[PDB]
């Protein structure tokens, strides 16, 4: 996260760190969506050009974390993975369309003041909140600039109009994507960066006062660059698949 | 899940985090 700040305690209880097991290394962010499902970006697990094909056996998640370099006894929970599910039409070769993945935890995780799921949007939440100038919040560890924090970082960013999103980049963008960030003329700065993918773009519904995850940190060109925007996987546009793996798989 | 999107340390204690009002404020600016 570029130009963000230290998260306060319990600010992002849905926050999940995704680790490679051996050698151990923090790969990506993720979010907890029930006691047993963790959401993340597909490119965090599967990226053929780099021969990356991480599976349930290769991966670990940590939940309830605040500090990347301090073991949070009686707070943080380490979880093993039952299975991993990557969206079938995840477009790794081109634009990372449908950059979404689901991971089932071996055993259900116990909720605390520090561990709590985020909500998934319905059509009414998407229709109302996915609008130009509306702010969402993005969280994660990893690069403070193009340099990796020990406290979880948080930044608020406005959704950008699709025409500006489209004209800003030569990448082909789909409806399964939206973009967020300040324009040059706005004074403010801020963007996700290397290490932040998989993390949640959340919004606080003014209707029921719950936080919803509307996006997943996906991609960008540089970090925090004038005239460029971060691009996020569009969660509601992929609910059909999300609901389907959750419904069909184990419970 | 039943109880999603509600933070035990914030919404539940009726407390606002340092920066969440900026979101609210931005949601009413779109008319
Ligand atoms: Na930018």
Curated annotation (Swiss-Prot), chain B:
Origin superkingdom: Eukaryota
Name by which UniProt lists this protein: Thrombin light chain
Organism this protein belongs to: Homo sapiens
Encoding gene per record: F2
Residues of the full protein shown: 333 to 363 of 622
């Amino acid at each position: 996260i570029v130009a963000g700040s230290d998260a306060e305690i319990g600010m992002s209880p849905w926050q999940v760190m995704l680790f490679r097991k051996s050698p151990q290394e923090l790969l990506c962010g993720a979010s907890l969506i029930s006691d047993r499902w963790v959401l993340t970006a597909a490119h965090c697990l599967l990226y053929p050009p780099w021969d990356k094909n991480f599976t349930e056996n290769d991966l670990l998640v940590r939940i309830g974390k605040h500090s990347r370099t301090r073991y949070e006894r009686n707070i943080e929970k380490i979880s093993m993975l039952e299975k991993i599910y990557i969206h079938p039409r995840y477009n790794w070769r081109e634009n990372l369309d449908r950059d979404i993945a689901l991971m089932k935890l071996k055993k259900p995780v116990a909720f605390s003041d520090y561990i709590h799921p985020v909500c998934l949007p319905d059509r009414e939440t998407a229709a109302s909140l996915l609008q130009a100038g509306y702010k969402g919040r993005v969280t994660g560890w990893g690069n403070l600039k193009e340099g990796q924090p020990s406290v979880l970082q948080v930044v608020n960013l406005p959704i950008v109009e699709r025409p500006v999103c489209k004209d800003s980049t030569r990448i082909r963008i789909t409806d399964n994507m939206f973009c967020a960030g300040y324009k040059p003329d706005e004074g403010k700065r801020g963007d996700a960066c290397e290490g932040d993918a998989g993390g949640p773009f959340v919004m606080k519904s003014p209707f029921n006062n719950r936080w919803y995850q509307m996006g997943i940190v996906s991609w960008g060109e540089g970090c925090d660059r004038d005239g460029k925007y971060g691009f996020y996987t569009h969660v509601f546009r992929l609910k059909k698949w999300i609901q389907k793996v959750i419904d069909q798989f184990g419970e | 899940e039943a109880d999603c999107g509600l933070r035990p340390l914030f919404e539940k204690k009726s407390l606002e985090d340092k920066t969440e009002r900026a979101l609210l404020e931005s949601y009413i600016a779109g008319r």
